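Usage example:
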Amino acid sequence: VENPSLDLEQYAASYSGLMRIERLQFIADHCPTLRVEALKMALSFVQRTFNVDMYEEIHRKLSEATALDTAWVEATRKKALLKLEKLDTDLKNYKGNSIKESIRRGHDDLGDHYLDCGDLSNALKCYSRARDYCTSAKHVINMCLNVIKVSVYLQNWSHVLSYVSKAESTPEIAEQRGERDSQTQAILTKLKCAAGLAELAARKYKQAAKCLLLASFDHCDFPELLSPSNVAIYGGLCALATFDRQELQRNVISSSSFKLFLELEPQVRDIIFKFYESKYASCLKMLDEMKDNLLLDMYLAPHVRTLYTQIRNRALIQYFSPYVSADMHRMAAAFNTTVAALEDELTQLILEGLISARVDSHSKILYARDVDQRSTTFEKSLLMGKEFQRRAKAMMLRAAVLRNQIHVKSP
Amino acid sequence: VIRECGGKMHLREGEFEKAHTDFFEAFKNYDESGSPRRTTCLKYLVLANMLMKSGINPFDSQEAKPYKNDPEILAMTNLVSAYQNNDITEFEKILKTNHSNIMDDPFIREHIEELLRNIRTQVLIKLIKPYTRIHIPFISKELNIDVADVESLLVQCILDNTIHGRIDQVNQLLELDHQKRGGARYTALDKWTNQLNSLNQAVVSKLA
Amino acid sequence: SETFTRDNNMGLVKQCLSSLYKKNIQRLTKTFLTLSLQDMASRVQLSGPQEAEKYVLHMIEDGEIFASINQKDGMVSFHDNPEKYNNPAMLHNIDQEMLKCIELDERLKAMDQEITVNPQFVQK
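Running the assembly step on the lines above writes:
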């Protein structure tokens, strides 16, 4: 059942900027929450944003329900252009004074108004001027955040990764420790939970989790980016699927940094802590209770299918690990499934080298098998010998035909 | 400035390593100054040295000698002794007889299950040393727990590389790993075979 | 059917179709330790336990699979334990396979020395 199991006020409060508009349009053009929330929620912020028309595709959808903001459409079109003229004139003056060594102030406000207009990377050249007319690395660190912010709404994840790599590798270990007790600014948190986000969009779950779990709760308030709550989910689900038990214990459960994140997301904390303790009867149920709440997320929905399948396969291997002869009835009753489907799941897992087990479908018992090293060695060595003799005979025949120069002429 | 009431829910959380380290310092700093808290401090000092399963018996190591024993709380002093001897019977007997006096305390709610689970682990680890195939109901008798609890304890121990064995559910067994065949000769033979399989192809392909 | 019968190898193709079943049944041995005949003749698409019985029996008779049928329960039990290499007859196999390589190496040396003395293979 697709239901609106979300509150729009907190989603609106957490985010700010164009990211909020994009998230609101995403939940809208899916099919929850539209009925009465969509018109009120979307139209509220279009007054301060550009491109105007984003409502109309969702507007006519109210017809089957069987706005009136028609005058506002022409109002924004005439008023948008006025802001551009002064800044188009402003850049001429900055070149006129020949103060290019200190025109960094000129691009301080040049790039914000361009992104406010929903423009493109055509403005990005100004940040390039930052690399040309600056001396200290501090301005480069400053403009790296701006270029990352403008590239977030560009789907240029590889480009984002390259620039995070540059920003982390060019300076001396990012100003080493940052004048002790970490830097006053929280740019480290941005460089962490932006590269991790880019790796997540690149279908690199383990690296995304490793980057996201290292964030900090000092400031952590990112209206322009993922909310503090979303960090917990992104770093928890991406870690439950790819981290081993030792890595899960060292980097997630025992970590004091991520405990504060887990404080405000109880569901993920309970899921992780009951997965760790080998309680799969209710861990999977709680995982399934929030499945139709991450499918509405914009950066996590396409991977919900891949993560949830990867988590379950990691549970099945963990359940059958201390056992040499397991009962399939209690095994199927602990995964909220039936023996008939559990048999198919186990067959798929055994077919690849994930579980070394054999199903006994008479008393429904999964036995653990052990490979005989001596017999396997003898078998593979004899097979190698047979192949070597075949290749030797083939090569001798090839030598004979090459010596006699036997070939078929084109004629 | 007080951490009670208004600041109490900040301290309501269980993570207390910060106070765990500071207990040794506060044993002497507030000994003659924190008189109202002295009664509860002497009980809690044992816990910090008790959690690492080390530190012999804090009954007489530091300057706590004037206090030594206290007539109303005596099994509390022998709790660390029973923990060191890894005797489950003494621990359970002390808990049942002196209940409401050792357990009464709050801070013991968060740590009693932690304490009475690292004794059973050591007892079980020592128990399985001479065996190669053991009965789960037999382990359920030494440890005053049910079968369903000992099976879960065995699963948790086997997962965290502490017990080298595997359970047998249909027979309620525990089969321990004891035999080590030649695993280095056959691995070497496998590597030799796999390398010859590639060297032969490399040699043959030269006659193209 | 036109291409396979124009090239005259029609009958060598139906052998592939008949061998697909025999490959699937052998692939059942890598996952199962005891299967039901009715249940087995639903993954390999044999359509009937009676026909699966003869399909397994033929494969056992040809030494393609290691299994045993139980008509009482109607279940196929896979053994998967052909040989342990402690037989004085396997030594004969290793001896023969070593002798064949010895003869092969002798041949290679024989038709290598005939090139080592070639008057053309002294100038280059």
